């Protein structure tokens, strides 16, 4: 066992707040914002040795990353940005930083009660997305 075990499983989106404005701040265009905002993704998190895999599955995109904590990787995001990403575990929170074109956004994933809470921030704009077990 590892501490990341509290994240493993299949999670379904149950609430979203401020996501459209977060996407505006990131630079997502209108049509992608509208279709992304309508999505009700599942998030599937698994661990195999040191490798963590996070899959986002929805109508109009399935996206998957695999990574080792603390080891930078190239990522193509659901909105088609090419970013450099690093994910670490800090005090029980998975912290995902994405860097591209002199910009940065941080995505935190935390277990709170029976929820997986995703907090997304860029400059001062935050969105909170709440998942429950599927």
Residues in contact with ligand Q4X by the rule CB under 6 A = 23, 26, 28, 32, 35-36, 39, 41, 43, 56, 58-61, 77-79, 107, 118, 120, 129
Task: Select from 62, 71, 88, 106 the one that contacts Cl ion (CB under 5 A).
Answer: 88
Q: For residues 134 and 124, what is the distance between their CA atoms, to the nearest angstrom? A: 31
Mutual angle of helices 30-38 and 19-26, in 10-degree steps:
150
Q: For residues 72 and 2, what is the distance between their CA atoms, to the nearest angstrom? A: 21
79 contact, one of Cl ion, ligand Q4X, none, CB 5-8 Å limit per kind: ligand Q4X
Task: Select from 44, 69, 95, 125 the one that contacts Cl ion (CB under 5 A).
Answer: 69
* Residue 41, phi then psi, degrees to nearest 5: -70, 155
The binding site for Cl ion (CB under 5 A) comprises 69-70, 88
């Amino acid at each position: 066992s590892h501490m990341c075990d509290a994240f493993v499983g299949t999670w379904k989106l149950v609430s979203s707040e401020n996501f459209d404005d977060y996407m505006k701040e990131v630079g997502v265009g209108f049509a992608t914002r509208k279709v992304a905002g309508m999505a009700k993704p599942n998030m599937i998190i698994s661990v195999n040795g040191d490798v963590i895999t996070i899959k986002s599955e929805s109508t109009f995109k399935n996206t998957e990353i695999s990574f080792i904590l603390g080891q930078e990787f190239d990522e193509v995001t659901a909105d088609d940005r090419k970013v450099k990403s690093t994910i670490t575990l800090d005090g029980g929170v998975l912290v995902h930083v994405q860097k591209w074109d002199g910009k940065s956004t941080t995505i935190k994933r935390k277990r709170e009660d029976d929820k997986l809470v995703v907090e997304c921030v860029m400059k001062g704009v935050t969105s909170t997305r709440v998942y429950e077990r599927a």
